[PDB]
Design a protein around this ligand. Structure first.
Ligand SMILES: Nc1ncnc2c1ncn2[C@H]1C[C@H](O)[C@@H](COP(=O)(O)NP(=O)(O)OP(=O)(O)O)O1
Ligand SMILES: [Mg+2]
Ligand code: NA
Ligand code: NA
Length: 326
DNA sequence: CCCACGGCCCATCACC
DNA sequence: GGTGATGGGC
DNA sequence: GTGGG
C-alpha cells in the first residue's frame, strides 16, 4: 500500500537522487534506494526510526531521519537542499538524457540552470544531450502496454523482413506482463553470429526500422548495442504519439538465452537467481552460466538452448516471466 | 578501523 | 593520427 | 549509508 509509508519512501528517494546527481555518491544513492524498497514492501505504517532499523538496509542514520520525519512531518536537510538554487538546478538537469552529475555541475557552474538555458546553449551539448533535451517531456512519459504491443508488432515484422533467420525478443518490464513500461528492450540474434565469430547484422535492423520511420533518432550505435528513439505512426486527425526510448542489443546465438533471462526478469529477481546459483556452485552473468570448481575456479560455459535450461542447471523450478518481480 | 557496494558498450575527452 | 580514461546509460 | 570483515 503506497499510502502506508509513502512520506518516508518519498523522503528516501529524494535523498537518493541528491546523493546521485549533486553529491556524486552512487553507493549512498543505492543505500537510500535499498532502504526505500524494503520499507515500501513492509506491511505496516512505521511509527519509529527504531521499528524501521530492524529492516535490512535501514541503519542508524535513516532511522534518525524517520524519527525527525514522523515527529515533525519534515526533514530539515531536505527542506534546505530543496530551496538551494545550485543543488536543485543540478538535480533537475540530470533529468535530461545524457546530462549526468558531471555535465549538470559544469552547466550550473557557468549559469546554465534550466531547459531554456540549454536551448540557448546547444553548441555546448553533445548529440545524445540534444536528443534528451528535444524529447525531455516524452522521455519522462510511461508506455502503456497497448502501445508496447503496437511497437513489438513493428519491431518483429521489420526484423523478419530484413532476414527471416533473425530471432528478436522484447524483454524488460514488457515481457514480465507489466501494464506500462519506461522503454523498449529488444534482444536480437542470428545463427550466423556465435561466440567463435558481421557487424552489419545490427546496422541492417536499425536501418530497416529507420526506412519505415519507426526509429527517429540515434543516441548511440555500435556493432552490438543500439540506443535510440522511436515513435508509433498516427492517423492525421489523431494526435502524434510520444517519442519513446528503444534499446536493441545483438547477442551471439549461444549466449542469447542468458541475455533474455538477464534483460527480462526484474533486477531483484536477477540478484536472487544469481545468489542461489552461487549456492549450487554456478556463476551466472548476462552472457553465460559456468560451474564453480572446488577452489572457486570458473569452468567453461554450459550449453544453453532455452531459458528453462538455466533454471534446470541450478535445480530451480522454472518461473514464467510474469512471476519474476523478486 | 576499513572496504564493498550489478558491470559493460559507446561517445567523447585528455593526452601522446 | 592513435590509446586509454571518463562520463553516461541501463 | 549500510553491512560486514
Ligand atoms: N545494472 C543494470 N543495468 C541494466 N539492466 C540491469 C542491471 N541490473 C539488472 N538489470 C536487468 C533488469 C532489467 O529488467 C533489465 C533491463 O531493463 P530496464 O530497461 O533497465 N528496466 P525494466 O525493463 O525492468 O523496466 P522499465 O524500463 O519499464 O522501467 O536488465
Ligand atoms: Mg525496460
Ligand atoms: Na539495521
Ligand atoms: Na541524465
Amino acid at each position: 500500500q503506497e499510502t502506508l509509508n509513502g512520506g518516508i519512501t518519498d523522503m528516501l528517494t529524494e535523498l537518493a537522487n541528491f546523493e546521485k546527481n549533486v553529491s556524486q555518491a552512487i553507493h549512498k544513492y543505492n543505500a537510500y534506494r535499498k532502504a526505500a524498497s524494503v520499507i515500501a514492501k513492509y506491511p505496516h505504517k512505521i511509527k519509529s526510526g527504531a521499528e524501521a532499523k530492524k529492516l535490512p538496509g535501514v541503519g542508524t542514520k535513516i532511522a534518525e531521519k524517520i524519527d525527525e520525519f514522523l515527529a515533525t512531518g519534515k526533514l530539515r536537510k531536505l527542506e534546505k537542499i530543496r530551496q538551494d538554487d545550485t543543488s536543485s538546478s543540478i538535480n533537475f538537469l540530470t533529468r535530461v538524457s545524457g546530462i549526468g552529475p558531471s555535465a549538470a555541475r559544469k552547466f550550473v557552474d557557468e549559469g546554465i540552470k534550466t531547459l531554456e538555458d540549454l536551448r540557448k546553449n546547444e553548441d555546448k551539448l553533445n548529440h545524445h544531450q540534444r536528443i534528451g533535451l528535444k524529447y525531455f517531456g516524452d522521455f519522462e512519459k510511461r508506455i502503456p502496454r497497448e502501445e508496447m504491443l503496437q511497437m513489438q508488432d513493428i519491431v518483429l515484422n521489420e526484423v523478419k523482413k530484413v532476414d527471416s533467420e533473425y530471432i528478436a525478443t522484447v524483454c524488460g518490464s514488457f515481457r514480465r506482463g507489466a501494464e506500462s513500461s519506461g522503454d523498449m528492450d529488444v534482444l536480437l540474434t542470428h545463427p550466423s553470429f556465435t561466440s567463435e565469430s558481421q557487424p552489419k547484422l545490427l546496422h541492417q535492423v536499425v536501418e530497416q526500422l529507420q526506412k519505415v520511420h519507426f526509429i527517429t533518432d540515434t543516441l548511440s550505435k555500435g556493432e552490438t548495442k543500439f540506443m535510440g528513439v522511436c515513435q508509433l505512426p498516427s492517423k492525421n486527425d489523431e494526435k502524434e504519439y510520444p517519442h519513446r526510448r528503444i534499446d536493441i542489443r545483438l547477442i551471439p546465438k549461444d549466449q542469447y538465452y542468458c541475455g533474455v533471462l538477464y534483460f527480462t526478469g526484474s533486477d531483484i529477481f536477477n540478484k536472487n537467481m544469481r545468489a542461489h546459483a552461487l549456492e549450487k556452485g554456478f556463476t551466472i552473468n548476462e552472457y553465460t552460466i559456468r560451474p564453480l570448481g572446488v577452489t572457486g575456479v570458473a569452468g567453461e560455459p554450459l550449453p544453453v538452448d532455452s531459458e528453462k535450461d538455466i533454471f534446470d542447471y541450478i535445480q530451480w523450478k522454472y518461473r514464467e516471466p510474469k512471476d519474476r518481480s523478486e
